Amino acid sequence: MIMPQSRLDVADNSGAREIMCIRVLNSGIGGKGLTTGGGGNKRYAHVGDIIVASVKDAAPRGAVKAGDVVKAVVVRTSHAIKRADGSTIRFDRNAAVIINNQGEPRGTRVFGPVARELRDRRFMKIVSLAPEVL
Amino acid sequence: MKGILGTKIGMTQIWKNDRAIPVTVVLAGPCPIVQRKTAQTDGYEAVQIGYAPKAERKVNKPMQGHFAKAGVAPTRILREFRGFAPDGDSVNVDIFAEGEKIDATGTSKGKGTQGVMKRWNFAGGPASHGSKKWHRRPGSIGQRKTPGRVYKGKRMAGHMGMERVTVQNLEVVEIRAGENLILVKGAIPGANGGLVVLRSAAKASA
Amino acid sequence: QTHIKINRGELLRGIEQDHTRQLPDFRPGDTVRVDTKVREGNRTRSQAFEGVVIAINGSGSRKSFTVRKISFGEGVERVFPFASPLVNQVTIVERGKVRRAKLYYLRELRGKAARIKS
Amino acid sequence: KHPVPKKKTSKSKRDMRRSHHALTAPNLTECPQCHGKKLSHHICPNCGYYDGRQVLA
Amino acid sequence: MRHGKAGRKLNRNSSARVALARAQATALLREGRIQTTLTKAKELRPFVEQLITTAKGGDLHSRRLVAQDIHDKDVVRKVMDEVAPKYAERPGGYTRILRVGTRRGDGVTMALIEL
RNA sequence: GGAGGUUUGGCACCUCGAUGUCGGCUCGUCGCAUCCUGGGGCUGAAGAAGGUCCCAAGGGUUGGGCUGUUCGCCCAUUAAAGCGGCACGCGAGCUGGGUUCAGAACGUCGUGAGACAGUUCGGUCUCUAUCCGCUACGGGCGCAGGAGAAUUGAGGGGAGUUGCUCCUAGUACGAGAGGACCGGAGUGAACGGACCGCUGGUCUCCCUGCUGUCGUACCAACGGCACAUGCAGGGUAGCUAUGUCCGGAACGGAUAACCGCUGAAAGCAUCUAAGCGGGAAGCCAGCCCCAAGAUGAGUUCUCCCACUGAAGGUAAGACUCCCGGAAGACCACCGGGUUAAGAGGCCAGGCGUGCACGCAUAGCAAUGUGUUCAGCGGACUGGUGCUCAUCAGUCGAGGUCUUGACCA
RNA sequence: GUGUCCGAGUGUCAAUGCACUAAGGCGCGCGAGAGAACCCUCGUUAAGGAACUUUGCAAUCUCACCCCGUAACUUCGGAAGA
RNA sequence: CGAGAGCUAACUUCCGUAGCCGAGAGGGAAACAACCCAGACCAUCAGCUAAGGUCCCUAAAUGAUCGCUCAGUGGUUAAGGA
Numbered sequence A: 001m002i003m004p005q006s007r008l009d010v011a012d013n014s015g016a017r018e019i020m021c022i023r024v025l026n027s028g029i030g031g032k033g034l035t036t037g038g039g040g041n042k043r044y045a046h047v048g049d050i051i052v053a054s055v056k057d058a059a060p061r062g063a064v065k066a067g068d069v070v071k072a073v074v075v076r077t078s079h080a081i082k083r084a085d086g087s088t089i090r091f092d093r094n095a096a097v098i099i100n101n102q103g104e105p106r107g108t109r110v111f112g113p114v115a116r117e118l119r120d121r122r123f124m125k126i127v128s129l130a131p132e133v134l
Numbered sequence B: 001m002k003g004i005l006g007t008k009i010g011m012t013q014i015w016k017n018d019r020a021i022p023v024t025v026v027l028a029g030p031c032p033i034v035q036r037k038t039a040q041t042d043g044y045e046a047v048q049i050g051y052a053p054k055a056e057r058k059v060n061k062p063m064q065g066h067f068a069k070a071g072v073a074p075t076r077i078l079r080e081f082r083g084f085a086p087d088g089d090s091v092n093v094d095i096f097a098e099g100e101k102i103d104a105t106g107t108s109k110g111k112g113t114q115g116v117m118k119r120w121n122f123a124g125g126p127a128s129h130g131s132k133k134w135h136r137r138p139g140s141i142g143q144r145k146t147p148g149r150v151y152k153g154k155r156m157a158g159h160m161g162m163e164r165v166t167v168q169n170l171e172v173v174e175i176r177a178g179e180n181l182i183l184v185k186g187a188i189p190g191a192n193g194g195l196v197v198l199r200s201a202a203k204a205s206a
Numbered sequence C: 001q002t003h004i005k006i007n008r009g010e011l012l013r014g015i016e017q018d019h020t021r022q023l024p025d026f027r028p029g030d031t032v033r034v035d036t037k038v039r040e041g042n043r044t045r046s047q048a049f050e051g052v053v054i055a056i057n058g059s060g061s062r063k064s065f066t067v068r069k070i071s072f073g074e075g076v077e078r079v080f081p082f083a084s085p086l087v088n089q090v091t092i093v094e095r096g097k098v099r100r101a102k103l104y105y106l107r108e109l110r111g112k113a114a115r116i117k118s
Numbered sequence D: 001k002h003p004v005p006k007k008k009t010s011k012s013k014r015d016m017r018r019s020h021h022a023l024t025a026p027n028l029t030e031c032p033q034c035h036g037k038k039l040s041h042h043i044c045p046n047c048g049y050y051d052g053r054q055v056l057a
Numbered sequence E: 001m002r003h004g005k006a007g008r009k010l011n012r013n014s015s016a017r018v019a020l021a022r023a024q025a026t027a028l029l030r031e032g033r034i035q036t037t038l039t040k041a042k043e044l045r046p047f048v049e050q051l052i053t054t055a056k057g058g059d060l061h062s063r064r065l066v067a068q069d070i071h072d073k074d075v076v077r078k079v080m081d082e083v084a085p086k087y088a089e090r091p092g093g094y095t096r097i098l099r100v101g102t103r104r105g106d107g108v109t110m111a112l113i114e115l
Numbered sequence F: 001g002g003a004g005g006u007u008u009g010g011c012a013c014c015u016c017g018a019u020g021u022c023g024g025c026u027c028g029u030c031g032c033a034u035c036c037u038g039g040g041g042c043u044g045a046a047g048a049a050g051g052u053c054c055c056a057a058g059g060g061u062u063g064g065g066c067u068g069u070u071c072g073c074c075c076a077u078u079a080a081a082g083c084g085g086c087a088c089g090c091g092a093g094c095u096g097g098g099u100u101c102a103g104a105a106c107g108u109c110g111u112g113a114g115a116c117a118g119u120u121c122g123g124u125c126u127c128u129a130u131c132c133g134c135u136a137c138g139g140g141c142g143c144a145g146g147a148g149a150a151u152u153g154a155g156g157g158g159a160g161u162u163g164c165u166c167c168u169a170g171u172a173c174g175a176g177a178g179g180a181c182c183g184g185a186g187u188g189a190a191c192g193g194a195c196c197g198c199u200g201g202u203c204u205c206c207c208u209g210c211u212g213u214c215g216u217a218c219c220a221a222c223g224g225c226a227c228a229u230g231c232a233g234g235g236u237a238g239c240u241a242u243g244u245c246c247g248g249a250a251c252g253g254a255u256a257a258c259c260g261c262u263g264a265a266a267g268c269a270u271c272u273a274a275g276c277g278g279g280a281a282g283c284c285a286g287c288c289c290c291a292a293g294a295u296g297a298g299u300u301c302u303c304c305c306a307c308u309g310a311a312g313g314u315a316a317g318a319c320u321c322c323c324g325g326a327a328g329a330c331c332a333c334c335g336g337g338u339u340a341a342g343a344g345g346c347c348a349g350g351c352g353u354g355c356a357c358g359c360a361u362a363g364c365a366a367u368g369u370g371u372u373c374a375g376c377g378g379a380c381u382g383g384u385g386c387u388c389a390u391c392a393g394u395c396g397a398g399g400u401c402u403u404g405a406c407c408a
Numbered sequence G: 001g002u003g004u005c006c007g008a009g010u011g012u013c014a015a016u017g018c019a020c021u022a023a024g025g026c027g028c029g030c031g032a033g034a035g036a037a038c039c040c041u042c043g044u045u046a047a048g049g050a051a052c053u054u055u056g057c058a059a060u061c062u063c064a065c066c067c068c069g070u071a072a073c074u075u076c077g078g079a080a081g082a
Numbered sequence H: 001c002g003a004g005a006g007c008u009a010a011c012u013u014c015c016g017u018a019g020c021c022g023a024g025a026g027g028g029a030a031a032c033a034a035c036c037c038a039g040a041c042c043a044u045c046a047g048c049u050a051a052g053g054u055c056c057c058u059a060a061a062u063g064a065u066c067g068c069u070c071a072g073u074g075g076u077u078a079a080g081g082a
């Protein structure tokens, strides 16, 4: 569960380290890139939901510097996620990974395992770069 | 229309194919056909049938004679199903087939006298930023002088519980025929072991 | 509330037992679940969780165990029902000495020296 | 704050309020093994028998 | 609500609930009968029956399991060597209540508890 | 030219033996001059996105930074971030930031005491609800006999939102880029009900570990106090969300703007003047819940009958009391009450804890191993007559009359 | 509220502190049930972490002793338990 | 009714004038100090009338005759249109 003010850790090498969320969305991956809408009142990003955020600390030398507005997608809840079989997964630390408005990541490689729900939301590009799913 | 009575037993895990699902086990045991109400002799069409036999020593005489018209053992519960005209006795197998939607009606669990934050999802009010309605309290209750009224219908502390509740489009997961059990997808209301009734969907949506 | 004379317990257990499988007795040492996952489109795939077993919960169909790994730097944990069809097989790797049934302290430790005894 | 009642309450409405304070006479019943009366599911105060003699006195 | 919980506070805290149970145990074991309020007697019966069945094991473990609740040694010997072997034949149900009726001061309905 | 009364006002009518005032918070409900959604007309409407007007109030209308703010600005989203009323709704509901009591300081005015609706720090918001009104829960009585149980629904409520994607179909349209109506399939969001199998919360003495100090003679082993659990570590049943399942709907009817059929008054034309058909998230019905104190008191099935002198023993049948209950403040409801598994206990199983005491051994010892998947035990599932539901008591029908029909 | 004097022990760097307790003294002159809403003093809390709000107000968090290490600035003492 | 002041606003304010109210009961105007009728000495289970009325509430013609409006106009305005 992501909410505004919840800092998350970037899952890529785009060159920010920490991004405080500022909105949950409700759009997926469409054929015109990312979708719009879904209703604008949802209040919890779970794994595989897009979420605007302000970058808080970044790396010196970086595509993304500090303070910039960026749409991340989330790959690592501390909260549990539960499959259609009854598995549960949880990760010690929350983590997200920045993107551009087509769903393509903005870093070279994703860093640490991503949830498999990303595969359910046709986020193919992110999950290609990821050392493990689950 | 078609329906039967039974008792909620408990909840469980289940695997249809590989998808784990929560089912609820009702026991819909055989029901005698006590009284066949027809509009030509009762003004409306219905059937009344029984569940959970009662020891004949515990019956009143009038109820022994009510059942005794029908050749039926005393049963602690009788109920009526509108538009329903079976034959013999209402076994649960014959009434249901696996996967069909069935409304599930039972009596909600009585939680007694409940506040507004619990009963109506009220907001609460700060738990530290000054008050002494720290939680719980409904706040204001009306306008002012014009309508001096507080609206009829107004939501308030009260008996949150014990309501009859219907729950729509539950899915028959499985039918054990010779046990008179019946699995239903997801939850039904009640304390365990309360009466409940299973019926055809009130709205057969496409 | 109807008042049948009924064993609620054996009634449940009779339908909860078709859906109960048993596997290798343990609790708290390290383990490898060889699971299927098929979310890969239509084709099927294996995948391997190996971590400490930190808890045992449930019975019959509802029984489920909790295993904890560190994969690529980040800690991971997971709850498998013993009954789950997407859990093909489970093998131990080594028995652990442990004074206690839960091992939630492993969450706070996350070092090499925060191991399980042999 | 400080609610108070408005108009003094009348004799009649007061009595309708007290309409429920009627006391309920105990269902007394005489001891089979003695003279006197005894409360049901208790020992006879006078004799002390609940079936033999149960209390001392 | 208590839609399944079990017990009673007796208008007191945890340690008080506890000493009261332990000490009325000690008394009705010391003395075979006592008279006390009807509530508190219904309270006492399952406690003290559990305890006599603890003492029905014979063993040093059973006597130490009783010694923890009954810290006057002489009652521990009574319940252990005198009373539990007596109830040897009894499948549970080592106590009864009859109700003596109502007290004057507070208008409580007191009762007797014996074995 | 009108309308509405939400603004700044005017006026001074009730209120100075008191009508608490701005903002927030909490609850809401209403209007419609309609922010979204639905149905339309015209369009400088190809398509798509629009403009603007008409009908439409069922529901819905986001979260943050700035300031006491309302407002406004901005962030980032949205189907949309509607406008007002209800003492600028709501302090016997809450705050107390603003402003408006005493302190003090600054600027400005005054020779001075002092001052400005200029500023700045600070500054007591009163346990007990009679009535009406509102949510719950009983008692009495009524319903032309006395009773157990099932019911019809007069008539009352709740619910009512929508986005996105896909198919149709890259078709109609379009030079092209773009790109549909209608119909069909799916998937979320927020909200609601229920539920506790799952994921977790908590479970104040169910199990364990820890310290100090007392105490059980001492050692061992335990208890007490360290909170009203000493602290920590887990935690079953219950209760619960962030957790699960369900929902909004379709079909129907009459309708608003609108669109038409037949068609005159005027041998044309015209949806109307007689007549008829089509048309909305709205009205009625349809879904779920209440309900015959619907004194208009309803129906059906069954039982006891016709007793003795308004009364009294009584039948059918309730209650009192006892024991309890996923029922509850009390009441009430549900179960059992000896032709009895109602609860307790006891036994077996479940689940929680995690290897008890003691003894053996290892080792200077701290401690380690075995016996020991041990020991212990709240609420869980069943059995079992070991304990309590003993004895009893109390109440409870003889059914008015008139008219009409059917029977000897 | 009320001036002066004496005020033991165990442990804890120390102490008249804190916890348990000797002596001594007392359970505070309505009780008993029950385990609704609400209210007061409290314990734990998923995920998030100040989003709350006039203001982080309140409640956390920090906690004693020992060793190491500590800035801008300075009136050379200090800031410093940084 | 006649003026001023006001916006040819006000249950506004200030004068002239008549009447009512103050000090006034009774019938009408659903209700209503001011409007319309009518100034209560007392008593009656008597009669004619005023204003206002005559379908039922609710006393009294579902009165009569020539029309007018098919809008519930009646039972809330205007410029303007038909």
Ligand SMILES: CC[C@H]1OC(=O)/C=C/[C@H](C)[C@@H](O[C@@H]2O[C@H](C)C[C@H](N(C)C)[C@H]2O)[C@@H](C)C[C@@H](C)C(=O)/C=C/C=C/[C@@H]1CO[C@@H]1O[C@H](C)[C@@H](O)[C@@H](OC)[C@H]1OC
Residues within 6 Å of the ligand: F018, F020, F126
């Ligand atoms: C009840 C709590 C206090 O409440 C108060 O202080 C409450 C006072 C109320 C609110 C006041 O009334 C208000 O006055 C406004 C100017 C107008 C307002 N409305 C109506 C427009 C009106 O409500 C006060 C002045 C009214 C009366 C009741 C009064 O003078 C009260 C005096 C005493 C009141 C109370 C006295 O409190 C005192 O405070 C000390 C700190 C206490 O230790 C104790 O002193 C012995 C206590 O008693 C004097």
Ligand SMILES: [Mg+2]
Residues within 6 Å of the ligand: A067
């Ligand atoms: Mg910038």
Ligand SMILES: [Mg+2]
Residues within 6 Å of the ligand: B124, B125, B127
């Ligand atoms: Mg709150």
Ligand SMILES: [Mg+2]
Residues within 6 Å of the ligand: none
């Ligand atoms: Mg008020």
Ligand SMILES: [Mg+2]
Residues within 6 Å of the ligand: B146, B147
């Ligand atoms: Mg009004």
Ligand SMILES: [Mg+2]
Residues within 6 Å of the ligand: B147, B148, B149
């Ligand atoms: Mg009124």
Ligand SMILES: [Mg+2]
Residues within 6 Å of the ligand: none
């Ligand atoms: Mg924990």
Ligand SMILES: [Mg+2]
Residues within 6 Å of the ligand: D001, D002, F126
């Ligand atoms: Mg007050």
Ligand SMILES: [Mg+2]
Residues within 6 Å of the ligand: E011
């Ligand atoms: Mg008390």
Ligand SMILES: [Mg+2]
Residues within 6 Å of the ligand: E053
């Ligand atoms: Mg035992």
Ligand SMILES: [Mg+2]
Residues within 6 Å of the ligand: none
């Ligand atoms: Mg007054």
Ligand SMILES: [Mg+2]
Residues within 6 Å of the ligand: none
């Ligand atoms: Mg007043």
Ligand SMILES: [Mg+2]
Residues within 6 Å of the ligand: none
């Ligand atoms: Mg309109």
Ligand SMILES: [Mg+2]
Residues within 6 Å of the ligand: none
């Ligand atoms: Mg539109």
Ligand SMILES: [Mg+2]
Residues within 6 Å of the ligand: F048
């Ligand atoms: Mg278009």
Ligand SMILES: [Mg+2]
Residues within 6 Å of the ligand: none
């Ligand atoms: Mg609205």
